[PDB]
Each structure stands twice: as C-alpha cells, then as structure tokens.
Design a protein around this ligand. Structure first.
Ligand SMILES: [Zn+2]
Ligand SMILES: [Zn+2]
Lengths: 171, 70
C-alpha cells in the first residue's frame, strides 16, 4: 500500500528535460496526445516553452501536430505567440495546419502579429497563412499587427497570390 | 545651453510603440497602454468590467484564464 511517485510528462516537457521525456516515450503504452487538466498535450507545453529538442522528440514518435487544448489552441498557436521561430518552422515542416482556428477564431498568425513576432509572422505567410481571415470578432491577423508589419505581410501575401479581401467569420 | 538633456517619450508597456497626441492612454497601476493593447492576450477584447488575470507576464479575461490557466 505504498505510493510510487513518478515524474509527470507535462512538467518534463515544460522544463525540457529530454532524458525524462525519452524514458516516458519508451513506455510505448503512454498516450503521446493525452492532454493535462486544461487539454495541453506534451507537444503543447514543449512548443509553448521553447523546448526545441523535446518538440522534435515528440514529433518524431508521431505525436499529432494539430492537437487542441481547452481553448482550441494548437502547438503552432503557442509557438507563434511566444515567438519560438525554430519551433514554428519545425511545426510547419511537419505539416502543421497553418490556418488552424481556436475558440475565438484566432489563427497562429493573429498571435505572431499581436506580439510583434515579425519573422515568425513572415514564416507563416511564406507558408500560406492567410492574412485576411477574421476571427469570430471581425479582426484579421494583420489587424493585430503594427502598420509596418501589416504592410510587410500584405506585400508577401500579395506576391504569393493571396486574395487580400477581408473574410468575415462564418459558421 | 550647457545642461544634459533627457529625451524619453512615453511608450506603450505592451508593444513599445509611441502615442499620438490625440489618443487616450490607459493607465493601469502606473503602466501606460494603447487602448487596443490593454486587452486580453488570448481574445484581444477589452476586459469586461476591467477584470483581468496576470499569468506569466500576460493579461487575460476571466473566461480565457479559466479555460487555459486556472
Ligand atoms: Zn501598445
Ligand atoms: Zn480573453
């Protein structure tokens, strides 16, 4: 009747403790995608806290890239919001849904713009992130940017052949 | 004139951009914000009843704080 204390995966992913994460991964019956009390997966936390090595480890074992937390954020929302450029690029390369919408209709580009993560925002548009998609409250990603970033992103989207017309939220 | 001069201008706590002379600057516990910057980090809306929760240096409305971090 003795308790056997364990390291929990979510803390290890937050802290980026790679050996502990690997030992957890070696238990093949662990659910790579299971979220914590707020629906944050191991991948959500690794991406949010900028733990590049752990992010890659999870991706390589086949963790679902577009998993959603309780607010419907994906790992890409969090990596973009917190300006972790390497992790954003990794996620895009492993086919993250670049226009994934959270409970507010926000895409990762909203947060990259809002937080002035200029190069992250550029990386997103370069890979097909729509600049004119309104969230549920009528705000486009570039509405959240400062004017110089807005213009830089609109120019990139134009060159890529995006339609820049405002897209009001439907459904 | 032979005196050193300071030149600092007020900027937004959140975005570090300057203020136009026409706009209202939100003061929240000594910190200056653009109106559109004193909003929830998650939904970008003004705080209902002015109520916000601080988490890891960002401000959230009750809904979003409860959904994500409570
Ligand atoms: Zn501001
Ligand atoms: Zn909110």
């Amino acid at each position: 009747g003795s308790p056997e204390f364990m390291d929990d995966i979510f803390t290890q992913c937050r802290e980026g403790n790679a050996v502990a994460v690997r030992l957890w991964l070696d238990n093949t019956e662990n659910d790579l995608n299971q979220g914590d009390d707020h629906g944050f997966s191991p991948l959500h936390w690794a991406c949010r806290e900028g733990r590049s090595a752990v992010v890659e480890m999870l991706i390589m074992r086949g963790a679902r890239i577009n998993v959603m937390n309780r607010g419907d954020d994906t790992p890409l929302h969090l990596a973009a919001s917190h300006g972790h450029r390497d992790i954003v690029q990794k996620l895009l390369q492993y086919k993250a849904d670049i226009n994934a919408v959270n409970e507010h209709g926000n895409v990762p580009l909203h947060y990259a713009c809002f937080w002035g993560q200029d190069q992250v925002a550029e990386d997103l548009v370069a890979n097909g992130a729509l600049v004119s998609i309104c969230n549920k409250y009528g705000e486009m990603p570039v509405d959240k940017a400062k004017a110089p970033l807005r213009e830089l992103l609109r120019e990139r989207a134009e060159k890529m052949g995006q339609n820049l017309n405002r897209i009001p939220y439907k459904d | 004139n032979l005196y050193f001069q300071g030149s600092a201008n007020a900027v937004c706590q959140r975005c570090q951009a300057r203020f136009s002379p026409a706009e209202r600057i939100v003061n929240s516990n000594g910190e200056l914000y653009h109106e559109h910057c004193f909003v929830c980090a998650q939904c970008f809306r003004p705080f209902p009843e002015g109520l916000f929760y601080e988490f890891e240096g960002r401000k959230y409305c009750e809904h979003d704080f409860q959904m994500l971090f409570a």
